[PDB]
Design an enzyme around this catalytic site. Structure first.
Site, PDB file in Angstrom:
ATOM      1  N   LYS A  37       1.076  -0.981  -0.214  1.00  0.00           N
ATOM      2  CA  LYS A  37      -0.059  -0.369   0.030  1.00  0.00           C
ATOM      3  C   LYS A  37       0.971   0.806  -0.327  1.00  0.00           C
ATOM      4  CE  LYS A  37      -4.417  -1.705   1.210  1.00  0.00           C
ATOM      5  NZ  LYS A  37      -5.084  -1.686  -0.087  1.00  0.00           N
ATOM      6  N   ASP A  49     -10.218  -1.308  -2.394  1.00  0.00           N
ATOM      7  CA  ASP A  49     -10.594  -1.394  -1.097  1.00  0.00           C
ATOM      8  C   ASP A  49      -9.876   0.078  -0.343  1.00  0.00           C
ATOM      9  OD1 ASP A  49      -7.655  -1.897  -1.097  1.00  0.00           O
ATOM     10  OD2 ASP A  49      -7.774  -3.583   0.162  1.00  0.00           O
ATOM     11  N   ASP A  50     -10.666  -0.065   1.111  1.00  0.00           N
ATOM     12  CA  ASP A  50     -10.452   0.778   1.725  1.00  0.00           C
ATOM     13  C   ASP A  50     -10.389   2.563   1.070  1.00  0.00           C
ATOM     14  OD1 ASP A  50      -9.536  -0.567   3.148  1.00  0.00           O
ATOM     15  OD2 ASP A  50      -7.642  -1.135   4.200  1.00  0.00           O
ATOM     16  N   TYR A  60     -16.073  -6.215   0.420  1.00  0.00           N
ATOM     17  CA  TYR A  60     -14.716  -7.100   0.516  1.00  0.00           C
ATOM     18  C   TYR A  60     -15.161  -7.943   1.684  1.00  0.00           C
ATOM     19  CZ  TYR A  60     -10.851  -4.688   3.421  1.00  0.00           C
ATOM     20  OH  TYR A  60     -11.003  -4.040   4.612  1.00  0.00           O
ATOM     21  N   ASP A 105      -1.392  -5.730   9.992  1.00  0.00           N
ATOM     22  CA  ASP A 105      -1.235  -3.597   9.692  1.00  0.00           C
ATOM     23  C   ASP A 105      -2.137  -3.125   9.839  1.00  0.00           C
ATOM     24  OD1 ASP A 105      -3.486  -4.908   8.028  1.00  0.00           O
ATOM     25  OD2 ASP A 105      -2.210  -3.678   6.141  1.00  0.00           O
ATOM     26  N   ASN A 160      -1.811 -12.628   3.276  1.00  0.00           N
ATOM     27  CA  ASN A 160      -1.225 -11.053   3.560  1.00  0.00           C
ATOM     28  C   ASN A 160      -1.136 -11.656   5.003  1.00  0.00           C
ATOM     29  OD1 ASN A 160      -0.979  -8.628   3.314  1.00  0.00           O
ATOM     30  ND2 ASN A 160      -3.169  -7.737   3.791  1.00  0.00           N
TER      31      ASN A 160
END
Lengths: 486, 490
Positions: free
Chosen positions: B41, B117-118, B162, B228, B256
């Site tokens: 990211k 996403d996000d 998601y 994360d 992940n």
């Protein structure tokens, strides 16, 4: 025109600094007119645990490149060594090993040296007890012998087992150990002292006057203040504080031992500089009645304005119409940003003012959440006006924590953030949840639910198990807490 | 039979280096996994500034990585995230998306992903004038790129909704997910993290339900062992929560992991064990996979990674003995992983370690004052348990000591902060137990040095954490006052 060791000692437990950092440290020490580096990382097998082992070939490559870069930038480089756990003082094969070794480092081209008997055991092997009266006699015996063997070099340091107040048996003034050291250590060899404690919050002038008198020489302060290799892990971006400029005339030096994280030691050194520079020409002033200069809050403001320069700038083209989606943009770190960061992650014993306040206020709002809760009709119309007003400046101030993180995280060169990412991501995380709570507190009159955040209530897991354990250790008070409704 | 199992690098924070990315490929292949998804990211050219072309230094390095993956027989998938500042309706914008994927296609990338996403549901006005909905826009452009690239073998789409929590109003009747299902070209695979971001477990009907509305089987993006989002925990536990049953209900699984590179050993090894456990099955608690088992096979292999424990003078029999480093062992790695287990449960060792400490605490009363009705089952219960405890607090200190006297410290230093804090509180806890158990040899306060450092709740963020709402149970314990006053006046 008086010799004074002032700089940095890499003397912490943990993954040691690497070259291009040490090479930077020297640029920085020079720019700010400091003059010394002590090499003493606890994690270099060859420095301490396994001291007898000579350096490797690859190791000699790296070690010599350092010593040159040091000599290049006008920084006196000191090699240190800690035989203690292992060594048998009496047996002279043992001593030979020690001399050989320091001659290898001498070969790499280092001129100044240091022995430490820090954090070892009080007890000698019977073999050694048969030769030596005292533990101190032992250390002094071979320290002296080495000092001479290397040709009585200008700079040479000895760090005693009893290296601060709370560590002298039974007290500083009558310690049989520190006496022996004082009497029998040679006069050109200097003594390292960490103050009245290990991590000493203040270093009283009368402290130094005491320990000076028993060791027959004004010591060099190894200063563990901003060090972070001791308890749970915290970060100390606060200024040099708690030592008078009066100390300076009564000292042969000050070497700060700081945060393990390298990039966190900007302020820690920059202010130490300002502190020294301020009164390096002062004369002993008789301040303990026995016969405008420096402000931490200012020295900090200088350091942070200068720090700004190392964060650097943030990140045909496309141009969106007035109804198209507007381009992501990166803002620069502000000064005010750093000033908050420093106050959040200040000193071991206190927070900084911006951080202290955020707490006081949160703590007020918590203890007054009742004044807005349907309750006694109004009970008061202006007690409320205050809490609501006061809540929304807190909402806003949390806001600036979240921004501080984003501007740090967009600024194009992330080497400084990255070196302390965990620390900064924790506070910003928790503030996000604290803001969300204060909001919930404004609205709890026509609901009786509980405070939740995506159904999880995640602040409960902080630290994971490490933390679960610490949260059971004893507390004074439970006036606070704010229990939650089922 | 073609099923994507491996790792997604998809985390907020400092990305993995070339040197680590090659070793991930070696290990994936050793363990017979097949896929890697490039979605860090923090890569400015991946998400925030997606429309900048890679420089030559960067192009050079991404060609080398892609070559690496080829060499170790790994599917490499280049993801891109244009959702923050894209203007869907405008064609210069789609051009750019295409040209950027063409740049990466020349580095020799075969397979691709688009990620939404996000981000928030909120389109710009120009776009609302054109597409029926956020899905409709996300879908229009994804289909158009996928086609433009010649409908690649492997093409992934990560939806904005998601997981279960993120759907609105809920999975079965979301209008967002309905549209993805209806209009996202069938050739494209869809990512999915389960019923939560970090799904504790992934039930089979949960998959049947989502499977239905998106009209395909999803590739799982699995956040189980990720940190994360919370950088104060580490996850050395085993893959678990997901039945070998859903291997034939899925099109792949991409884990992940922890941000820390060297904490992801168990997390991948146990994932691979799980995939192998039932690669070939049909449709119609978990009989082929046991986490406890797969964990142990993994720890046994991880141990040879930690290497050997460092090391002509001899001490006399009355001279001072030599230093001696000791080896790391398996009960060491078994305790580590059990302290740093999973996001939603501790290891049995750690879980015991705690239950015991909280008991001792609760029955301190019995050893506080004197002796009265203090039986076997009162006092000398405690005295016993308390010393059984003291000894295992000891064992924690061991595993630190021994981890830090390896010859090769890479694995440690990558987790230093986590493993240090655990050993430093264990230390601090043991001293408490001692003091509890002899509150009649004096009647001090509980103290260290001569103040109390655990009280600094590890930072300012710590002092804020305690003031947030609290369980109402796991009862407190209070420090007695100084007892020694200093005034005539009351």
């Amino acid at each position: 025109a008086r010799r004074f060791l002032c700089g940095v000692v890499e003397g912490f437990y943990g993954r040691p600094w690497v070259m291009e950092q040490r090479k930077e440290l020297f640029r920085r020490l020079q720019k700010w007119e400091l003059n010394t580096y002590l090499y003493a990382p606890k994690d270099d097998y060859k420095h301490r645990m396994f001291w007898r082992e000579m350096y490797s070939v690859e190791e000699a490559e790296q070690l010599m490149t350092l010593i040159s870069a040091a000599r290049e930038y006008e920084i006196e480089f000191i090699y240190a060594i800690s035989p203690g756990l292992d060594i048998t003082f009496s047996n002279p094969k043992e001593v030979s090993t020690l001399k050989r070794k320091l001659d290898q480092v001498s070969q790499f081209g280092c001129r100044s040296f240091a022995l430490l008997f820090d954090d070892i055991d009080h007890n000698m092997c019977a073999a050694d007890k048969e030769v030596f009266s005292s533990f101190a006699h032992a250390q002094v015996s071979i320290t002296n012998e080495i000092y001479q063997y290397l040709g009585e070099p200008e700079t040479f340091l000895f760090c005693p087992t009893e290296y601060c107040g709370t560590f002298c048996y039974p007290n500083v003034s009558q310690s049989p150990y520190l006496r022996t050291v004082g009497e029998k250590l040679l006069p050109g060899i200097e003594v390292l002292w960490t103050g009245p404690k290990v991590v000493s919050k203040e270093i009283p002038v009368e402290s130094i006057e005491e320990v000076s008198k028993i060791i027959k020489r004004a010591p060099v302060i190894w200063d563990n203040i901003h060090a972070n290799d001791y308890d749970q892990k915290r970060l100390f971006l606060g200024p040099y504080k708690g030592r008078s400029t009066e100390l300076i005339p009564r000292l042969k030096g000050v070497l700060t031992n700081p945060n393990c994280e390298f990039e966190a030691n900007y302020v820690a050194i920059h202010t130490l500089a300002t502190w020294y520079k301020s009164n390096m020409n002062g004369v002993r002033k008789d301040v303990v009645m026995t016969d405008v200069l420096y402000s931490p809050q200012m020295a900090l403001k200088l350091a942070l304005t200068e720090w700004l320069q190392e964060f650097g700038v943030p990140h045909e083209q496309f141009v969106p119409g007035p109804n198209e989606k507007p381009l992501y943009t990166a803002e620069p770190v502000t000064l005010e940003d750093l000033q908050l960061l420093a106050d959040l992650f200040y000193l071991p014993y206190e927070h900084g003012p911006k951080g202290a306040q955020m707490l006081r206020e949160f703590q007020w709002l918590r203890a007054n959440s009742s004044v807005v809760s349907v309750n006694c009709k109004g009970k008061d119309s202006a007690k409320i006006a205050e809490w609501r007003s006061r809540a929304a400046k807190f909402e806003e101030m949390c806001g600036l924590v979240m921004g501080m993180f984003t501007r740090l995280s967009n600024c194009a060169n992330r080497t400084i953030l990255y070196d302390m990412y965990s620390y900064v991501w924790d506070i910003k995380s928790i503030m996000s949840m604290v803001k969300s709570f204060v909001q919930w507190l404004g609205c709890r009159s026509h609901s009786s639910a509980q405070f939740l955040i995506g159904d999880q209530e995640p602040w409960a897991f902080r630290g994971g198990l490490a933390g679960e354990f610490q949260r059971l250790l004893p507390i004074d008070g439970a006036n606070d807490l704010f229990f939650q409704p089922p």
